[PDB]
Symmetry: C4
Subunit: 287 residues, 4 copies
């Protein structure tokens, strides 16, 4: 009988936790899908906007409001854009693992996954001297064998699963891994992404519509007392109008006295110190 | 030949019937489409949210306003999430049939469909102690022979067809079957669903826009006097922002003096008592 | 290739409005794939058009004494004769829309002729009417189609999108009025969701669809064109959509600069102006 | 070491540049994808609306507010619609290059691309007596070798790339070429286009929603100080409702004292006079 995740107690009289997170995907989701995307200068320029413009713009916004940010960086982004990635670490923001070439884990065996985890840790170490304690699977998809590899690599937390509003201890072998759950609604990819021959049907929402959608989710989460995890991509949300609406929303959230605006590893550490009973879903069985 | 469905008289001065229905699809629509979806821990975690989080949240909302909900539960959902499905029965809400592994009926022969009906019935009996009197076809698609299978199985009603605003008696020979019609617009799936490689192009509507769409339909349905059947999925509408907007909408509907907020079997028994002349569409001939 | 000039409107009017309806029902699906006939759920959704949408929309047109033009595939007429007859008894024009709503992509002149005759014969035999108007199914036709239409003595075509103003299509020895349309003045892109056939799942609120048509209309009033709206009873006939359309019709009826007319009446006004015929020609390559 | 583009200084104390641009695509994007689109009288009539109706409607609106516009004209459009294209030159607006038959550059070698540049220039010269100094790649996609071709053909600027909010000088060796960057958000195609069997899913936005999107972007660009380049297609934005909404947006923009509303060559010459250090992205390397 799988228990649903229960509410966690938050610190400092706070009753909701909020994390602003950024997946610095840049070119990597396209290159892993089809390496011939490398030849598309137009498309590669749209992707390069994230690390080149979006990353400094978003860091200026986080710094204006003294907000911790968590940047999930694919190792290949770090190798192709080391000055943008180092600027994140230099600004004092946490960097977390997001694969090497943002590889799909669908069909991946344990050995393939283990090589990608090493390759991403080494790139982030080389480029920015960071050893990530956090992970998010590219494309928010992972295998039933993935958490044990994350445990083997000593990761503090994962932020990939969507079966809860509350953080929890994901049971892994004879231990656990903190889970900081996400949702497709709390992602700018479905709001702004348009990349011909790759992603998006042509629908490009207004920045007000996107904030509206997140604000309705946040107000509800404040009543639930969960961990509200927002995911944005610098090549999308770093654009002028979207960044300007995220800045206004961030100002609004920092003004909420009931909310703990925090880094992902700080959230995960606070959860870990609660010594919760681990839980996990199991693979669906079919006769 | 074929007549349109005529309005039914609602009980005790009510002039519109409203039914809040929930399809506890969870993993099953993906698993029948491709069993390899079982390997996707992420997608499976998104689908498990429905029974784990969506179902208690929605029960809490239905409870706050004393609203009856009808929960269409595939047999597989009941077998994989027995506690949430048992929680629905214990709360006093109706459980109705929705296949076993939410199978598509497209191309299913009568025997294939009978075997699925049996399998779903046995699952809901086993897990929840329920024998459903209501049926909704997975993916809202059935065969010209399905109504006669449902009648043969003793179902009170079907809630799959969309040729009417008014409930009616579906012509099935010597048997009897009430039809409680639905429509694609009164479904949250086209408003909120996004599951890569399965369904959804990326469009995720705000909760206010989905309520706005449903309220325009409900206010117009109140002038028509039909049966307004809303279908939500717990893994979609159970999300915080969406359930909060649903909650407010349900309060609003409870304040409509003219509307009868009822369970699906209560609506179907009222329709059955009117003794309507049966009717049916027939397969197009080419 | 000269652009179409503004046409003079009668007496004090400076702009024409035509409310049109394509009673497509089952036919676009059945021609795309005959196996759609086995889909009872989908077949019930398309049947709503003739069964429910047509009397609702006829009722609204009656309340505001608005003439409507109904483009009816011959198949819809044979499958739904009473809904089609009911249009003609209400005094509204019935126009040609193929037989089984066939795509004209890749058809030779003989295939298009046979279809033209089949549709005329169905509308004559079912409703005792003879169409003077034509609109290609899927709004697509061949460069050889205007000549075929002129040969069948049609008064007008309503398919082309190269002008805001009606015009005389060059067809040699014959005559043929074009009353142009546009994708923005279609409800299909606003409301259509049929699994395995049309829509990505996007379903717009009725207010959004009216806001979009109203933007166009208000601009067309300054241009002096012919604003031709296209709606499908299986879509716009739904409670919420029909209600917002009714309020929109009430609003258009209070615009004294606007001529709200039937399509053959607009076409006969245009024909009386004795315009110089024009036509686009097939783009030639290298 | 790639540096992001720096802000440029604008004239007359302005702090933002704005360009109204139009791609007179007409029939050409469809005819290059599949020549059988020529048989489709309905679809061809929809495309012919751009040059027959949209071009004189948009020229009337530009004339009303004394706004320069830049029209990117495929050479095929000039040949099929010479009078609408000539009317653009007569009204004094700039005409720029957009291929011949709006050809995709995906898989194009430099010879195929040079032959298209020549075909396009000769069609524009023969039709409207104009020699284009501007270029935009059909489908906003080009090869890593395209900028050098543009410099060698004597082009002043390109407006295809998306790695910057600011104009910059592209690294093209001994030659020179201004980049006037663009964005998918500042395009009407994603907002209004529905062409069966070619482009669009059925989503057709209201004109107020498109304008809302572009104004959120423009307001944020005014604080950034870049060049906000709008792209519209007469066959889409020339429609009564869309043109009327564009007309009122242009009136609002002419009322902004901080904005420089200009032609693309006017903006590019002002950039070129600043003598910026050339920069360029490089092809992603994959091991
Ligand atoms: Cl990025
Ligand atoms: Cl569910
Ligand atoms: Cl219809
Ligand atoms: Cl155009
Ligand atoms: Zn990612
Ligand atoms: Zn279902
Ligand atoms: Zn049609
Ligand atoms: Zn173009």
């Amino acid at each position: 009988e799988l228990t649903p995740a229960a509410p966690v107690s938050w610190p400092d009289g706070k009753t909701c936790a909020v994390a602003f997170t950024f997946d610095v995907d840049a070119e990597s989701p396209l290159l892993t899908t089809d390496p011939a995307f490398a030849d598309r200068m137009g498309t590669m320029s749209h992707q390069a906007y994230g690390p080149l413009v979006g990353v400094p713009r978003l860091l200026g916004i986080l710094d204006e409001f003294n907000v911790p940010g968590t940047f999930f960086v694919p190792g290949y982004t770090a190798h192709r854009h080391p000055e943008p990635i180092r600027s994140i670490a230099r600004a004092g923001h946490e960097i977390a693992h997001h694969g090497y070439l943002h590889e799909s884990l669908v069909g991946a065996d344990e050995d393939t996954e283990r090589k990608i985890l090493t390759r991403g840790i080494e790139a982030l170490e080389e480029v920015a001297g960071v050893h990530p304690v956090g992970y998010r699977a590219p494309m928010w998809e992972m295998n039933w064998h993935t958490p044990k590899l994350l445990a083997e690599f000593g990761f503090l937390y994962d932020s990939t699963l969507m079966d809860s509003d509350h953080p929890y201890e994901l049971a892994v072998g004879d231990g656990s891994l903190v889970e900081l759950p996400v949702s497709w609604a709390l992602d700018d990819w479905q709001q702004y992404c348009f990349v011909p021959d790759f992603s998006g049907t042509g629908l490009i929402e207004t920045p007000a519509k996107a904030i509206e959608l997140w604000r309705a989710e946040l107000n509800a989460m404040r009543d639930i007392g969960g961990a509200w995890v927002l995911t944005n991509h610098p090549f999308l949300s770093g654009r002028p109008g979207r960044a300007a609406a995220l800045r206004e929303f961030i100002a609004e959230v920092c003004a909420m006295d009931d909310v703990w605006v925090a880094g992902m590893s700080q959230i995960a550490e606070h959860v870990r110190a609660q010594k919760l009973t681990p839980r996990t879903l199991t693979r669906p069985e079919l006769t």
